Amino acid sequence: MCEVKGWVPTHRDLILSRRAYVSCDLTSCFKFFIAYGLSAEESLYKTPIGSANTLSTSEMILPGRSSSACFDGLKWTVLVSNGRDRNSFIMIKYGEEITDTFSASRGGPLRLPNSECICVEGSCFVLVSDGPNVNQSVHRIYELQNGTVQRWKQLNTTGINFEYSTCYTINNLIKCTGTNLWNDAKRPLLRFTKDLNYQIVEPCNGAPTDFPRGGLTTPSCKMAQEKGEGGIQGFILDEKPAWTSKTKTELSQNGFVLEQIPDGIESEGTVSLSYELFSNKRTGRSGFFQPKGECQRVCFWLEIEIQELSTFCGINS
């Protein structure tokens, strides 16, 4: 059908930025990011993908410290979190209007994933996390329409933590990669549908892809507990073939390696093809985005160190 058989690069008064990601409308793609100062408060800004982030090129959206954004074919849905603890909240804008809010249920802070949310046939889906401790975190999928919350589903994530969710959609399934900041150096995976049925699975190989992490181990569908605490946003293309991604080694954030696994992420993890990128550059967060115009496209963004996003897109059938 539409196997991803490789990846190619597609993009290579300054505002200081963190938690950036990419999202696209029908013609163009944007960097959404949290601006926290000037190369001489915290607010979601947006900039055309070809430009540097600067007061002249970047557009302020709303105050906040995490975010998500997605285009539904008609208008932008944007979410930001702000406030603290039990008074932490998320606000949502649809086009130019603020359309909804909700507050923390489990002690806060409310946290958005800092990757694009996923719109399918006018509904948009976003993962929201809550809870003050990574060892007792709560995660919900919120379904939106026109920037208004229609419903949500809290997930059973007992025994894991699922932060920094980065998601894509193929064939009206939505698939997200999580970062476990508590007790796993492998990345938890989420699969869900427009009806909010879902499955959470663990990679069954022996090569953890979080940073920090331990060394390689025997393949199994067990969690990789060694150096499981902490983590950084990243992605796994959860298809057949699957593709994993990680720093070159567990000792350094240099480099970025992509590995193709034809039998999928729940198999023993035999690699058929690998890439090595950015060999002597420090790399950071990574996540999915999907441009909008046969097979559905999938791309990824990656922080590189002065710290900028590069983007790569998948080549299909």
Ligand X SMILES: *[C@@H]1O[C@H](CO)[C@@H](O)[C@H](O)[C@H]1NC(C)=O
Ligand Y SMILES: *[C@@H]1O[C@H](CO[C@@H]2O[C@@H](C)[C@@H](O)[C@@H](O)[C@@H]2O)[C@@H](O[C@@H]2O[C@H](CO)[C@@H](O)[C@H](O)[C@H]2NC(C)=O)[C@H](O[C@H]2O[C@@H](C)[C@@H](O)[C@@H](O)[C@@H]2O)[C@H]1NC(C)=O
Write out the residues near ligand Y by the rule CB under 6 A.
156-160, 200
CB 132 to ligand X: min, Å? 9
Would you count residue 180 as binding Ca ion (CB under 5 A)? yes
Q: Rounded to whole angstroms, how far apart are CA atoms 290 and 136?
A: 32
Q: How far is the CB of 199 from ligand Y (least distance, A)?
A: 7
231 binds Ca ion (CB under 5 A): yes
Contact pick of 163, 210, 238, 303 for Ca ion (by CB under 5 A)? 210
Q: Using the rule CB under 6 A, which residue among 57, 99, 105, 145 binds ligand X?
A: 145
Nearer to ligand Y, 160 or 237 (CB): 160
Contact status: 73 vs ligand X (CB under 6 A)? no
In the three-class reduction of DSSP (H, G, I as helix; E, B as strand; rest coil), residue 137 is classed as coil
Q: How far is the CB of 185 from Ca ion (least distance, A)?
A: 5
Question: Known binder of ligand: residue 210?
Answer: yes
Give the integer Cα–Cα distance in Å for 291 and 253. 28
Report whether 180 belongs to an annotated binding site.
Answer: yes
Instruction: Choose the contact partner of 110 out of ligand Y, ligand X, Ca ion, none; CB within 5 to 8 A by kind.
Output: none
98 binds ligand X (CB under 6 A): no
72 assigned to a ligand binding site: no
Peptide bond preceding 109: is omega within 30 degrees of 0, i.e. cis? yes
Site track 104-133 with ligand X (rule: CB under 6 A), x = hit? -----------------------------x
What distance in Å separates the CA atoms of residue 206 and residue 269, rounded to the nearest whole number? 7
Tell me how far apart the alpha carbons of residues 100 and 29 are, in angstroms, rounded to a whole number.
Answer: 25
Interface with Ca ion by CB under 5 A: which range of 75-83, 101-109, 135-143, 203-211? 203-211
Burial letters 256-271, b for 16+ CB under 10 A, else e: bbbbbbeeebbbebee
3-state secondary structure of 293: coil
Q: How far is the CB of 97 from ligand Y (least distance, A)?
A: 37
Dist. CA 307–CA 317, nearest whole Å: 33
Partner whose footprint covers residue 146, from ligand X, ligand Y, Ca ion, none (CB < 5 to 8 Å by kind): ligand X
> 230 a known binding residue?
yes
- CB under 6 A: which stretch of 22-30, 142-150, 237-245, 291-299 binds ligand X? 142-150
Asked if 161 interacts with Ca ion (CB under 5 A), we say no
Binding site partner of 200, from Ca ion, ligand X, ligand Y, none, Cβ cut-off 5-8 A by kind: ligand Y
Which residues lie below 8 Å from residue 209, measured CB to CB, with a gap of 6+?
Answer: 185, 186, 187, 203, 234, 236, 244, 245, 246
For residues 123 and 220, which CB has a smaller minimum distance to ligand X in the complex? 123
The dihedrals phi and psi of 264, each to the nearest 5 degrees, come to 90, 170
Is there a binding annotation on residue 238? no
Which neighbouring-strand residues pair with 47? 31
Tokens describing residue 182 = 């508590």
The reply on whether position 135 binds ligand X by CB under 6 A is yes
> Cβ of residue 238: shortest distance to ligand Y, in angstroms?
14
Rounded to 5°, angle at Cα 25 from 24 and 31: 35
User: Which among 196, 180, 32 has a CA at the least distance from the CA of 188?
Assistant: 180
Nearest 5°: phi and psi at 135? Answer: -85, 0
Binding at 166: pick from ligand X, Ca ion, ligand Y, none (beta carbon under 5-8 Å per type): none
For residue 238, count CB atoms less than 10 angstroms from its CB and return exposed for 0-12, middle for 13-18, buried for 19 or more: buried
Instruction: State the residues that interact with ligand X by CB under 6 A.
Output: 133, 135, 145-146, 148
Binding-site sequence positions for Ca(2+):
180, 184, 210, 228, 230
